Design an enzyme around this catalytic site. Structure first.
Site, PDB file in Angstrom:
ATOM      1  N   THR A 151      -5.016   6.346   8.473  1.00 36.22           N
ATOM      2  CA  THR A 151      -5.958   6.502   7.162  1.00 36.22           C
ATOM      3  C   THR A 151      -5.821   5.382   6.535  1.00 36.22           C
ATOM      4  OG1 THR A 151      -3.822   7.339   5.908  1.00 36.22           O
ATOM      5  CG2 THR A 151      -5.196   9.083   7.445  1.00 36.22           C
TER       6      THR A 151
ATOM      7  N   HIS B 184       0.893  -1.305   0.048  1.00 35.61           N
ATOM      8  CA  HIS B 184       0.022  -0.005   0.088  1.00 35.61           C
ATOM      9  C   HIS B 184       0.708   1.189   0.074  1.00 35.61           C
ATOM     10  CE1 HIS B 184      -0.007  -0.142   4.477  1.00 35.61           C
ATOM     11  NE2 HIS B 184      -0.058  -1.676   4.484  1.00 35.61           N
TER      12      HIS B 184
ATOM     13  N   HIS C 169       3.829  10.996   6.013  1.00 33.85           N
ATOM     14  CA  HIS C 169       3.557  10.778   7.546  1.00 33.85           C
ATOM     15  C   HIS C 169       4.698  10.133   8.142  1.00 33.85           C
ATOM     16  CE1 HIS C 169      -0.684  10.355   5.784  1.00 33.85           C
ATOM     17  NE2 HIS C 169      -0.504  11.686   6.051  1.00 33.85           N
TER      18      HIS C 169
ATOM     19  N   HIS D 282       6.333   6.967   5.936  1.00 38.26           N
ATOM     20  CA  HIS D 282       5.813   6.714   4.620  1.00 38.26           C
ATOM     21  C   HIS D 282       5.049   7.936   3.809  1.00 38.26           C
ATOM     22  CE1 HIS D 282       2.360   6.067   7.182  1.00 38.26           C
ATOM     23  NE2 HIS D 282       1.600   6.499   6.095  1.00 38.26           N
TER      24      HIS D 282
ATOM     25  N   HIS E 241       1.861   9.169   0.715  1.00 38.95           N
ATOM     26  CA  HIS E 241       0.767   8.883   0.149  1.00 38.95           C
ATOM     27  C   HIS E 241       0.789   9.757  -1.243  1.00 38.95           C
ATOM     28  CE1 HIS E 241      -1.205   6.775   3.539  1.00 38.95           C
ATOM     29  NE2 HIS E 241      -0.743   7.614   4.016  1.00 38.95           N
TER      30      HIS E 241
ATOM     31  N   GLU F 126      -3.603  13.221   1.586  1.00 38.17           N
ATOM     32  CA  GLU F 126      -4.916  12.895   2.287  1.00 38.17           C
ATOM     33  C   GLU F 126      -5.520  13.931   2.640  1.00 38.17           C
ATOM     34  OE1 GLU F 126      -3.283   9.157   4.508  1.00 38.17           O
ATOM     35  OE2 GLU F 126      -4.558   8.267   2.871  1.00 38.17           O
TER      36      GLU F 126
HETATM   37  N1  LIG Z   1      -1.254   6.417   7.152  1.00 40.22           N
HETATM   38  S1  LIG Z   1      -1.230   6.710   8.776  1.00 40.22           S
HETATM   39  O1  LIG Z   1      -2.670   7.313   9.589  1.00 40.22           O
HETATM   40  O2  LIG Z   1      -0.173   7.729   9.006  1.00 40.22           O
HETATM   41  C1  LIG Z   1      -0.931   5.082   9.363  1.00 40.22           C
HETATM   42  C2  LIG Z   1       0.080   5.076  10.540  1.00 40.22           C
HETATM   43  C3  LIG Z   1       0.292   4.090  10.875  1.00 40.22           C
HETATM   44  C4  LIG Z   1      -0.222   2.813  10.536  1.00 40.22           C
HETATM   45  O3  LIG Z   1       0.190   1.533  11.263  1.00 40.22           O
HETATM   46  C5  LIG Z   1      -0.962   2.921   9.526  1.00 40.22           C
HETATM   47  N2  LIG Z   1      -2.059   1.629   9.111  1.00 40.22           N
HETATM   48  C6  LIG Z   1      -1.319   0.441   8.740  1.00 40.22           C
HETATM   49  O4  LIG Z   1       0.105   0.597   8.686  1.00 40.22           O
HETATM   50  N3  LIG Z   1      -1.846  -0.436   8.279  1.00 40.22           N
HETATM   51  C7  LIG Z   1      -1.391  -1.860   7.912  1.00 40.22           C
HETATM   52  C8  LIG Z   1      -0.428  -2.241   9.287  1.00 40.22           C
HETATM   53  C9  LIG Z   1      -1.260  -2.139  10.619  1.00 40.22           C
HETATM   54  C10 LIG Z   1      -1.212  -0.971  11.476  1.00 40.22           C
HETATM   55  C11 LIG Z   1      -1.481  -0.730  12.611  1.00 40.22           C
HETATM   56  C12 LIG Z   1      -2.228  -1.864  13.206  1.00 40.22           C
HETATM   57  C13 LIG Z   1      -2.368  -3.148  12.396  1.00 40.22           C
HETATM   58  N4  LIG Z   1      -1.713  -3.094  11.146  1.00 40.22           N
HETATM   59  C14 LIG Z   1      -1.347   4.081   8.937  1.00 40.22           C
HETATM   60 ZN   LIG Z   2      -0.101   7.493   6.125  1.00 41.31          ZN
END
Ligand SMILES: NS(=O)(=O)c1ccc(O)c(NC(=O)NCCc2ccccn2)c1
Ligand SMILES: [Zn+2]
Length: 257
Positions: free
Chosen positions: A195, A61, A116, A91, A93, A103
């Site tokens: 997000t 992603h 982010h 990371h 977007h 975003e």
């Molecule tokens: N895009 S964001 O709001 O900065 C963000 C920050 C940290 C994150 O872990 C995520 N979400 C994410 O990484 N999802 C895939 C891995 C995950 C993250 C959190 C809990 C379970 N699995 C989004």
């Molecule tokens: Zn993010």
């Protein structure tokens, strides 16, 4: 599995993650006129001098630059935050076109990308525990516009060929995230969520007013990454952004007038 395509994109996420329709979802449009200046907001404290980047990973992603978060090496404090938050990863977007990709939006304006920097509250001991808490994370969001190159981003851009497809990781040591920060640390802040799934409502968002500029060549290299794994049909990793969500009962505060 969730994604950003036609049949699994953001408008579908609520089926697997019902919190997608929650009360504090991110991102949001930042209406700069409606944001209230708060004089009790402290300046942000970014202490990145001792940061230890370890590797870079295509997770299907985005790509994450990961840090050693087993000690207070790269921490965020101050601002709206109580206590110390440790940097775990950053990371981005981004869009398929320079006119979209961020975003958060600012008075409905979309930037080409958004960085982010993800931090977790040390009182919870680790990231997995922090995400279960309403004050578990602090994400520092920084907009990217296309213009002059950002020299501090080039080492990220140059390693992306080694992590083109989902699941690939690369050693990525000695990367200094201070090279990604704009001059000013003026910010907006509001309570929100991750997000991407699981969309947990655990984030104090801190979004910097000043974007950084990156070159067209730099953002073009982001767009060469793939959502798919190696040996699967190629789908370019572009438009991996969630659109703005309802602000509901929230107020965005500004650290500046
Ligand atoms: N895009 S964001 O709001 O900065 C963000 C920050 C940290 C994150 O872990 C995520 N979400 C994410 O990484 N999802 C895939 C891995 C995950 C993250 C959190 C809990 C379970 N699995 C989004
Ligand atoms: Zn993010």
């Amino acid at each position: 599995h969730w994604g950003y395509g036609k049949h699994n994109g953001p408008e579908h996420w609520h089926k697997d993650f019902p919190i997608a329709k929650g009360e504090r979802q991110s991102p949001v449009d930042i209406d700069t006129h409606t944001a209230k200046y708060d004089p009790s907001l402290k300046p942000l404290s970014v202490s990145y001098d001792q940061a230890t980047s370890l590797r870079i990973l295509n997770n299907g992603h985005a790509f994450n630059v990961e840090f050693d978060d087993s000690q207070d090496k790269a921490v965020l404090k101050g601002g709206p935050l109580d206590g110390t938050y440790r940097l775990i990863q950053f990371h981005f977007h981004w869009g398929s076109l320079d006119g979209q990709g961020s975003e958060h939006t600012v008075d409905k304006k979309k930037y080409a990308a958004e960085l982010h920097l993800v931090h977790w509250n040390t009182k919870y001991g680790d990231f997995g525990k922090a995400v279960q808490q309403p004050d578990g994370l602090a994400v520092l969001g920084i907009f990217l516009k296309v213009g002059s190159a950002k020299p501090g981003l080039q080492k990220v851009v140059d390693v992306l060929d080694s992590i083109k497809t989902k699941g690939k990781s690369a050693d990525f040591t000695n990367f200094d995230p201070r090279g990604l920060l704009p001059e000013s640390l003026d910010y907006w802040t509001y309570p929100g969520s991750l997000t991407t799934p699981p969309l947990l409502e655990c984030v104090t968002w801190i979004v910097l007013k000043e974007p950084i500029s990156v070159s067209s060549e730099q953002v073009l290299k982001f767009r060469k990454l793939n959502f798919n794994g190696e040996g699967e049909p190629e789908e370019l990793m572009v438009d991996n952004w969630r659109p703005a969500q309802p602000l509901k009962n929230r107020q965005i505060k500004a650290s500046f007038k």
